[PDB]
Write a protein that binds this ligand. Structure first.
Ligand SMILES: C[n+]1cn([C@@H]2O[C@H](COP(=O)(O)OP(=O)(O)OP(=O)(O)OC[C@H]3O[C@@H](n4cnc5c(=O)[nH]c(N)nc54)[C@H](O)[C@@H]3O)[C@@H](O)[C@H]2O)c2nc(N)[nH]c(=O)c21
Lengths: 748, 152, 23
């Protein structure tokens, strides 16, 4: 164990900033490993493999190290190469592919260290590219194979071209032929910005191909990647080269899942920093290397924010670059990447806070500039990305005493109030109020912005003292109020609710009066509302037996609490959890006529996504319970064989999981049906009226449909068949069907 | 296997604080902590309402419950609370990220808990407030004012 | 662990922005 922990720490120490030059530490580490070679061969091989798989940002270093070991022990190099091939095959079979990319890159860089012969790796990359010639195969897998090839190229391209220029040219021709005839249907769904200026959000494969071509035009002369092995030009040159075995890629299987396509998040230019080192161009492989290294650094240390910030700040490079701008750009790319960020968003905001703390003289200005540029380009930003931006900016301001030069954004006052910029400002102020008190937000915005401030979060009771008595249900409301103040029981509340002149089993006036009084009396805190809802839960169940009752309860709750959207969301959450209203009722309420004015607000879609997440978590929980029961049944059966009620319980759990899956299917079907209905209604109205179809309402609605698809692709891949057969058909309007087609191409 | 440096998470490790009124040994307390989903949030302001905490901590995952820190006698907010999540992952994320973040211009300290039991929502301080409030001497407006020792 | 330095930096930055707009 001591030898194990020691060796691990030792192998993971190389790379960290040290007084001794990197070359000296590498040589010492190689010598130490060779010294203990004959007793820990397998351990050393496994440690090096896992380090190559889990620390891509340090790639070159470890690469060199292997070469140094190969420069002394040929057998070690051969065994290590075989282990790498085996690990890569395991990763491909394991359906994880980022590790496969990192291992392929490690192998590619091993060529520079004179560990692997160039011709063998040229053959391996030839097979990679020839995978694009397969028939009846998802485009995602061909895309990934070409991506692995082109991403390995920045590291071993010089050597491969110098050794096998003809075969490399043929491989490039095949890659160009493939890239010419690719499908770009998925791009608009994933682009953060639809605008072509000032920075197109080009597809990742197209961007990488452009950068590789620029590098090839530059005679493969790159100026960023560290190449420690160069310092050992002598030592590494006398080493004998190994030959890879003919590598055939694992055959496509129906169980195979491939990484989804991504769009490069470009938002900075060299002109944005006219004082620091020149920023590498968008179509320069240096930019890609920097972005990938920073993404890997974030992924490795995504848990601890302080360590991640320290590592990001101290990212080394052959030539100086504007590190602050690169860090901000990659962090925003992670936050805004679609379908979902690699990690949680609160992590990104806190990491930006920590980075600003680490570098308080430069980074805050870069963050302010980035925020201003993000605001300026709001006219075409994705609504999902707009929500993420709103949340991040609200949290940032909350962390910095809600200080900002709002006057710089004064241009949003003049234009339409529903437009992306004033809408973003309103939603940001609403979130800021959510993280503070209403009066605190009125004191920070300049008086000219008062129109965009949030409304006071106060309850609206229809049966107030000033309210007229003509409204039916005033006496009953007063009686219910006094009963509530008297610590009433459910039976006597039912008794008082007995006397209601039913306008029509389901009474709308009864539900209205009850819910209004209950919410008004518990309109001081969330705890009070929770206690009142739970205490009178039986009344809710009795009055909300039917779907109409649940919809009316939701409508009345919205009417009472419309200036306090956080209260709406919390109350809906509690009602769903308590089973007062199902998820279908909430989904129908979101598209109800009452919420047409608030349809484009962020809290509505937060509520919808929270309900979907609740359903997903419920299904997962019941599935986990069923799996645990089945596993314990198998364990008991095997133990008994080695030497009735449980089967009934298993069948009951199977029934419950089947019901939960059916409920999830119904929820998603209902949501898609309502989205289709609203969008087709708008499109028909625009066609008959001869007006423009691209309006803020349409943009928001279509982007929210896209948001549902993107967030819950993992669960909609199951319903794919019924979605294609019932909702999304040929007869559907092309505008709406485009979202479904893009979702289809996302993982196909 | 997996690199130990990456597996490190210093923001989620158990703190040196242990409950003083718990009926049990330290082994059982640690067993409860290792699977608990409840977090103690401290250094709040007396005027920090439940809604702001709900927002800040629901930003890091779904919340099961929130219990404000009332005073022992006056029954008013004391500057602490308990946030109970539905899963351990959300609580871990809250410790990783919400910890150290500002809420109402105050640095919020988030710590693990052994769960909530009736009577834990009141400050153990003999003056009705929190022990730190009773012992502190610096003027903190968000915490009512001077420490309870200064006036009496 | 007080980040007053960062707070002062942000305050000065926003003050400079406001002054530049005013001028
Ligand atoms: C700080 N904290 C409080 N809770 C919970 O909040 C409720 C009321 O607490 P409280 O605010 O009444 O203080 P206690 O913790 O009861 O007593 P504490 O301050 O820990 O006692 C400190 C001991 O050191 C003594 N002491 C001696 N000198 C000093 C001093 O100079 N300053 C302070 N503050 N204490 C001193 C003090 O009198 C006492 O004997 C209860 O549930 C608490 O458990 C916490 N829960 C978790 N999970 N993690 C925490 O960090 C945490």
């Amino acid at each position: 164990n001591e030898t194990e922990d020691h060796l691990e720490s030792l192998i993971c120490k190389v790379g960290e900033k040290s007084a001794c030059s990197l070359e000296s530490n590498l040589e010492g580490l190689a010598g130490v490993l060779e010294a203990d070679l004959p007793n820990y061969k397998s351990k050393i091989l496994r440690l090096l493999c896992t380090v190559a798989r889990l620390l891509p940002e340090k790639l070159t270093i470890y690469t060199t190290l292997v070469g140094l070991l190969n420069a002394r022990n040929y057998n070690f190099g051969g065994e290590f190469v075989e282990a790498m091939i085996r690990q890569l095959k395991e990763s491909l079979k394991a359906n994880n592919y980022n590790e496969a990319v990192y291992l392929v890159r490690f192998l590619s860089d091993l060529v520079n260290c004179h560990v692997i012969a160039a011709p063998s790796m040229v053959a391996m990359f030839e097979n990679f590219v020839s995978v694009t010639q397969e028939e009846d195969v998802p485009q995602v897998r061909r895309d990934w194979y070409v991506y692995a090839f082109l991403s390995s190229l920045p590291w071993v391209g010089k050597e491969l071209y110098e050794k096998k220029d003809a075969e490399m040219d043929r491989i490039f021709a095949n890659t160009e032929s493939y890239l010419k005839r690719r499908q770009k249907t998925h791009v608009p769904m994933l682009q953060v910005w639809t605008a072509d200026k000032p920075h197109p959000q080009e597809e990742y494969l197209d961007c990488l191909w452009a950068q590789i071509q620029k590098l090839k035009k530059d005679r493969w002369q790159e100026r960023h990647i560290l190449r420690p092995y160069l310092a050992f030009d002598s030592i590494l040159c006398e080493a004998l080269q190994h030959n890879l075995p003919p590598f055939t890629p694992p055959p496509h299987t129906e169980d195979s899942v491939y990484p989804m396509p991504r769009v490069i998040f470009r938002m900075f230019d060299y002109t944005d920093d006219p004082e620091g080192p020149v920023m590498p161009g968008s179509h320069s492989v240096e930019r890609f290397v920097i972005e990938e290294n920073l993404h890997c650094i974030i992924k490795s240390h995504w848990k601890e924010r302080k360590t991640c910030a320290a590592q990001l700040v101290s990212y080394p490079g052959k030539n100086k670059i504007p590190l602050n701008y690169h860090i901000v750009e990659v962090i925003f790319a992670e936050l805004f990447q679609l379908p979902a960020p690699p990690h949680i968003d609160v992590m990104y905001t806190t990491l930006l806070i920590e980075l600003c703390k680490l570098q308080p003289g430069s980074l805050p200005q870069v963050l302010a500039q980035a925020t201003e540029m993000l605001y300026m380009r709001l006219d075409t930003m994705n609504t999902t990305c707009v929500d993420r931006f709103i949340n991040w900016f609200s949290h940032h301001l909350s962390n910095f005493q809600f200080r900002w030069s709002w006057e710089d954004w004064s241009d949003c006052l003049s234009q339409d109030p529903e437009s992306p910029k004033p809408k973003f400002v309103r939603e940001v102020l609403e979130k800021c109020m959510r993280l503070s008190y209403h009066q605190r937000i009125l004191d920070i915005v300049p008086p000219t912005f008062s129109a965009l401030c949030p409304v006071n979060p106060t309850c609206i009771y229809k049966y107030g003292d000033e309210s007229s008595n003509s409204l039916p249900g005033h006496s009953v409301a007063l009686c219910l109020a006094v009963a509530f103040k008297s610590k009433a029981t459910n039976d006597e509340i039912f008794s008082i609710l007995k006397d209601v002149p039913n306008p029509n089993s389901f009474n709308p006036l009864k539900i209205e009066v009850f819910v209004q009084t209950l919410l008004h009396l518990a309109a001081k805190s969330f705890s009070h509302s929770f206690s009142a809802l739970a205490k009178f839960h039986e009344v809710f169940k009795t009055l909300a037996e039917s779907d109409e009752g649940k919809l009316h309860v939701l409508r009345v709750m919205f009417e009472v609490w419309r200036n306090h959207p956080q209260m709406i969301a919390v109350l809906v959450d509690k009602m769903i959890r308590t089973q007062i209203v199902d998820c279908a009722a909430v989904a129908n309420w979101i598209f109800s006529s009452e919420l047409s004015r608030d349809f484009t607000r962020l809290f509505v879609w937060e509520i919808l996504h929270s309900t979907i997440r609740k359903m997903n978590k419920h299904v997962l929980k019941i599935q986990k319970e069923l799996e645990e029961a089945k596993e314990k049944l198998a364990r008991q059966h095997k133990r008994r064989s080695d030497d009735g009620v449980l089967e009934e319980q298993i069948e009951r759990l199977q029934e419950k999981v089947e019901s939960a899956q059916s409920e999830q299917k119904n929820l998603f079907l209902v949501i898609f049906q309502r989205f289709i209905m609203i969008l087709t209604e708008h499109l028909v109205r625009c066609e008959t009226d001869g007006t423009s179809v691209l309006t803020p309402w349409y943009k928001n609605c279509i982007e929210r449909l896209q948001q549902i698809f993107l967030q819950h692709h993992q669960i909609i891949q199951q319903y794919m068949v019924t979605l294609e057969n019932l909702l999304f058909t040929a007869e559907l309007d092309p505008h709406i069907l485009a979202v479904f087609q893009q979702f289809c191409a996302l993982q196909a | 296997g997996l690199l130990k440096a990456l597996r490190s998470d210093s923001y989620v490790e158990l703190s040196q604080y242990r409950d003083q009124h718990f009926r049990g040994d330290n082994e059982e307390q640690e067993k409860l902590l290792k699977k608990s989903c409840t977090l103690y949030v401290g250094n709040l302001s007396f005027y920090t309402t439940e809604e702001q905490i709900y927002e800040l901590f629901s930003k890091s995952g779904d919340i099961k419950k929130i219990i404000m820190g009332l005073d022992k006698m006056k029954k008013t907010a004391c500057g602490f609370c308990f946030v109970e999540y539905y899963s351990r992952a959300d609580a871990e994320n809250a410790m990783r990220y919400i910890n150290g973040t500002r809420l109402d211009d105050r640095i919020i300290r988030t710590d693990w808990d052994a769960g909530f039991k009736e009577g834990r929502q009141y400050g153990r301080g003999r003056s009705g407030g929190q022990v730190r409030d009773e012992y502190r001497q610096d003027y903190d407006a968000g915490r009512g004012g001077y420490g309870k020792l200064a006036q009496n | 662990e007080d980040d007053s330095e960062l707070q002062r930096a942000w305050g000065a930055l926003i003050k400079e922005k406001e002054q530049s707009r005013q001028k």
